[PDB]
């Protein structure tokens, strides 16, 4: 397999729970770039209004698909490496 041009361009196949979350916001495919996964996760958070309205770096997700994926009731968007760790557990890397 070729090394991706950037981390954002890594090709991935979401595992079933994460794929269900993506499809809930309109995703149609089984394979995505990491950047695409991050955009659909942002769209899920905004359309379901999960961010704290006053402190918008905090996300509340207790028991929704997202909280079940990440295994937490809330998280801070500022915890970049923690969020990536949680996302990666829910992906398989694929060729190209």
């Amino acid at each position: 397999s070729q090394i991706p041009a950037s981390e954002q361009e890594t090709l991935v196949r979401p595992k079933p729970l994460l794929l269900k979350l993506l499809k809930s916001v309109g995703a149609q495919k089984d394979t995505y770039t990491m950047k695409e996964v991050l955009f659909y996760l942002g769209q899920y958070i905004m359309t379901k209004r999960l961010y704290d309205a006053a402190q918008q770096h905090i996300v509340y997700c207790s028991n929704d698909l997202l909280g079940d994926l990440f295994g937490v009731p809330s998280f801070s968007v500022k915890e970049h490496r923690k969020i990536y760790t949680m996302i990666y557990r829910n992906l398989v890397v694929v060729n190209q």
Binding site: Q8, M34, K35, L38, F39, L41, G42, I45, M46, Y51, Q56, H57, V59, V77, K78, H80, I83, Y84
Partner: peptide, 11 residues
């Protein structure tokens, strides 16, 4: 800062 802008700083 908007959630949109915080999340833009991940990718």
């Amino acid at each position: 800062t908007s959630f949109x802008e915080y999340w833009x700083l991940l990718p």
